[PDB]
Amino acid sequence: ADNRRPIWNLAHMVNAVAQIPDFLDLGANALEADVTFKGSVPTYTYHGTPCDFGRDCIRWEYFNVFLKTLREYTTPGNAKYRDGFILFVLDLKTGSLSNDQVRPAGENVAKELLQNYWNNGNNGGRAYVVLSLPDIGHYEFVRGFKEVLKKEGHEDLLEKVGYDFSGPYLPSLPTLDATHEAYKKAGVDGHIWLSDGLTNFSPLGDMARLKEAIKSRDSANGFINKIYYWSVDKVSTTKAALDVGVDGIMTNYPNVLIGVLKESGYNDKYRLATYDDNPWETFKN
């Protein structure tokens, strides 16, 4: 009965486990963590310098420990369970991988999530996971990822998994068509998130890009389920993001969106997503 767009309030760059409850306490229903790779091996949650102004850039955790901790906060019945914590984005830093490393990196991430987050299908964490890849050309990561989960008898866990192919930013930015095709190549026919905001080498075209993605998401045969804007920390820009029609707001300060959502002119149109808002479902106005 609620006609309002569910919004994902994504805590940006939450790479230390100590930071998780703090960001959820600020009101995030989601968080984002940067997954570093040593070869094909996902190793740390760690962003590194430079990072957003006003942020310490070098908080980190071992990937497995981070995933295990996410499990704690997202397993019903767990002492640490937060029913408000419904999704996380893994910003997979595969950008330096040689081609041979890409598929195994997907397998490795799948294995990590399987073991540490989903506990091999044994009362795993319930949050949705967005695999964010920085290259549409890394679709074999997704193929490798899916293979592992299916081969291990946990294809059903793919219900919890979504994808965001975002980049590369050189030689040129990806078109939507190119992105859509990359999903097709990954065997991905839904659970598609699109991220925007991080590139602005052409503000006119970036304005255009976002609107194009919004139009695409809302088109009859659209492939994008959710659009999230990296990042937004001010009330004004938070409102602007909501107003242009994004589904998710990546932010250093989740408390900002919480406040905006409570405001007149916002509380009638937008609301904080809950677990029952399928992140893979395109919002129909």
Ligand SMILES: [Mg+2]
């Ligand atoms: Mg990141």
